[PDB]
Amino acid sequence: DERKITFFMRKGADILSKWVGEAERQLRLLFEEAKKHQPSIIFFDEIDGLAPVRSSK
Amino acid sequence: DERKITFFMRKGADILSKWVGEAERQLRLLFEEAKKHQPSIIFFDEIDGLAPV
Amino acid sequence: GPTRRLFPTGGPFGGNDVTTIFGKNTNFYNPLSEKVVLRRKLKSFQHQDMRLKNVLKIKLSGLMDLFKNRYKRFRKPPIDDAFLVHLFEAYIKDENMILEVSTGRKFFNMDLDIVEERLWNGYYSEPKQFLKDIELIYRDANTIGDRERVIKASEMFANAQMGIEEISTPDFIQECKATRQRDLERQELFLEDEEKR
Amino acid sequence: GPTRRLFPTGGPFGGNDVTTIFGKNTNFYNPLSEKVVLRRKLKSFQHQDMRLKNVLKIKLSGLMDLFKNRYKRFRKPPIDDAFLVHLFEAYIKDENMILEVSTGRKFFNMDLDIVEERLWNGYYSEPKQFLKDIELIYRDANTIGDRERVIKASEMFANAQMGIEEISTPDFIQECKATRQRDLERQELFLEDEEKR
Questions:
Q1: What is the dihedral angle through the alpha carbons of C11, C13, C16, C17, rounded to the nearest 10 degrees?
Q2: Quick one: how far is CA D45 from the chain centroid?
């Protein structure tokens, strides 16, 4: 009531874009949207679709 | 004394930047200069970086 | 009368009814047995290379259209063409750079139409020519603006860079190197031809 | 009464109430078993090739719209029609060429509307008819004028040549060859018929 805590539902591979690194901008906009409300919590669904482990390359 | 073994010195991927054809033109001028001054030595320091595998 | 175009666009298809400040490639035609056999192989290999340039335009348009209809602000130089109109016959012409007096900045600015109008005529012997246009887009990014516009136009420059990375392939690279030596000999013979004629 | 057109335009669709100076193809209709079977196959393959001529006109208009609305100066011969009006019934008529007494120049001039209203009727059995039309455009460039006009019209001649090179394709080339001879055996029988009738 006094501090409405917001939510941001974000999936894994939607952030990972084509181009080159505009996937970075897809979360730059999200993070600057994290500062329009203060009580802001970020959800990254399927984070392994963004940052998986080094296998051989 | 009267003939010059004029020495050309290059570094490891000094020719090779991320731009593709600047290295091409640099090699063209390098070998053209080698052709002009007939006795010449061309050295590629750290050629394992200029020609990596 | 003639178009007041500053960039060196011209080739076997057209675009030769132009006049600029720096070097311009206006060429359809402008001992003896070597000259005539040179002309014969010039006609033949130039027809083949113009077919190759048309194929290059065909495989470039699929991305060029997206990169032309995505953004429009960089499809027009910040400095209006009229300020460069009066120097054809504030702004002063260097070797190829135009210098302004108020600030003193150098701009190699285009309007992003020049690559496809260049391949309309066709002298892109090498995907290095497209690399030059992409680096020159990066140059327009660098010359004018603050950090935000510079970084966004650099992202676009990197987009054209990935595109040319896919366009540039080793077999096309070797074919284009062969035609690159061919057309360097061609441009040498053409400059001596216009100097002698 | 009849139109005062000197060019040999005529086909199954229409435009066959014309009179010219040189040869003219007015063709709707002008032992015996071979004659009647010949007329039967004439009707059949003429309908098929006339549909093919419509298809050719369809794939040709896509470039002739641009090539006819881009310039208008070459859509009108330098010499007015009136000087050629009085020779139907200064300028003298040779085999097909018109000679002018004052200067002595020879002009195979057209008005750039002739090819499309030729395909309106339709006798373009081969792409070589379009090749000859573009070569006649080049002839108009060569015969009258100086430097700049000649090279500009030659630039358009090259543009039209590049267009027909795309229109001319080996499958269509071999089909066109099948109809070329189809219309050849057709033209020989047509002159022999108009001579015997």
A1: -170
A2: 21
Vertex C132: Cα angle to C130 and C138 (nearest 5):
110
This structure's resolution (Å) is: 3.8
For residue C91, what are the β-bridge partners? C100
User: Token pair for residue A31?
Assistant: 């993070």
Residues in CB range of A19: below 8 A, 6 or more apart = C155, C158, C159, C162
Q: Flag whether residue C197 sits within 8 Å of chain D, measured between CB atoms.
A: no
Question: Nearest CA of chain B to the CA of C118: how many Å?
Answer: 20
Look up residue C94 and give its two tokens.
């260097």
> How far, in Å, are A43, C26, C73, C128, D36 from residue C136 at the CA level?
40, 22, 16, 12, 72
Experimental method: cryo-EM
How far does the CA of residue A20 sit from the closest CA of chain C (Å)? 7
Closest CA to C3 of C28, C23, C20: C20
Task: Please name the chains neighbouring D, where neighbouring means 3+ C-beta pairs under 8 angstroms.
Answer: C
Chain B CB contacts of C128 under 8 Å are 20-21, 24
In sign, the C-alpha dihedral spanning C163, C164, C166, C172 is positive
Between the CA of residue C79 and those of B48, C82, C99, C137, D13, what are the distances in Å?
A: 47, 8, 11, 15, 57
Q: Which helix (H) or strand (E) holds A42?
A: strand A42-44
Strand partners, B9: B43
Q: Is B29 on the interface with C (CB under 8 A)?
A: no
The three-state secondary structure class of C98 is strand
Please report the DSSP string for B1-53 in residue order. --S--EEEEE-TTSS--SSHHHHHHHHHHHHHHHHHSSSEEEEETTHHHHS--
> What is the distance between the alpha carbons of residues A15 and A56, in angstroms, rounded to a whole number?
24
3-class secondary-structure state, position D99: strand
Beta bridge partners of D36: none
Q: Name the region of C172 (left: φ>0; alpha: ψ -120 to 50; beta: rest).
A: alpha
Contacts of C17 in chain D (CB under 8 A): 152, 155
**Is there a contact between D162 and C13 if contact means CB atoms under 8 Å apart?**
yes
Q: Does the CB of A21 have a partner CB in chain C at under 8 Å?
A: yes
